Task: inverse folding
């Protein structure tokens, strides 16, 4: 538990490290504007706007 | 379960316009995201806005693109929105 | 005034089976390559191999990929191979 | 060949640097063998195996 959460913690830090080593970038399609709105959304914590991905449906086929 | 993945309401709605196949791919992207926040190779992902705290990213699922954020502190990945193939 | 772009003979084959619109996107790619060897934002370019001197890059021109090299010392860029959307 | 050609040389170095700061990255289907081969392909300096990209005409409609 305590040992594994530390292990998961370490995994996260390592992953965010490599992220850090990635250069910022866009596609024509994406503007600094829209990016601003995106950070804005990303930090929005109002529930009504979100749903857990795990509660998404499972293929009909 | 490493990371908790959340989807914005409007994305969930847009998701229903997708072919069974594309939807399946999205779910795999979700499954992978929970272990690996930036699956660079498999989804040609790029860091839009990097800021030590939350980062914005763009993933390519083929016929469309998904933009999401990664909150490293809370370990929360949010699917912000979808975009076309990229009109070029 | 900047880089000199070359296309390998084997690639010409793949080019003539390209719809006219996709071919045009390729000629534009060529022209931008003359000034910007790694037009990342424009063609989602990634560095496959970075031997600091001669590098390999993969560019996307819509529904097909373009693999080329940049020789920083010679200022020469070579279009090496053309590839599909890309999964198997 | 001038101070401009020299100015050009600086630009190339800067872009070279930008490329150096970039992380190596590959596509699922691109292998080390393919890379090794592309690499050998790129080393070919046989004038006849290549054609100036600028020899290609902008098509008629």
Result:
């Amino acid at each position: 538990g305590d040992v594994l959460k530390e292990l998961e913690r370490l995994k996260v830090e390592i992953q965010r490290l490599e992220a850090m080593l990635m250069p910022e970038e866009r596609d024509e399609d994406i503007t600094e504007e829209e990016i601003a709105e995106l950070l804005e959304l990303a930090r929005d914590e109002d529930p009504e706007n979100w749903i857990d991905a795990e509660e998404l449906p499972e293929p009909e086929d | 379960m490493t990371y908790r993945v959340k989807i914005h309401k409007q994305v969930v709605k847009a998701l229903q316009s997708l072919p069974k196949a594309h939807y399946r791919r999205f779910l795999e992207f979700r499954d992978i995201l929970e272990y690996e926040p930036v699956p660079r190779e498999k989804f040609d992902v790029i860091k839009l806005e990097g800021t030590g705290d939350l980062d914005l990213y763009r993933a390519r699922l083929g016929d469309y693109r998904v933009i999401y954020s990664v909150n490293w502190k809370d370990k929360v990945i949010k699917i912000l929105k979808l975009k076309p193939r990229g009109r070029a």
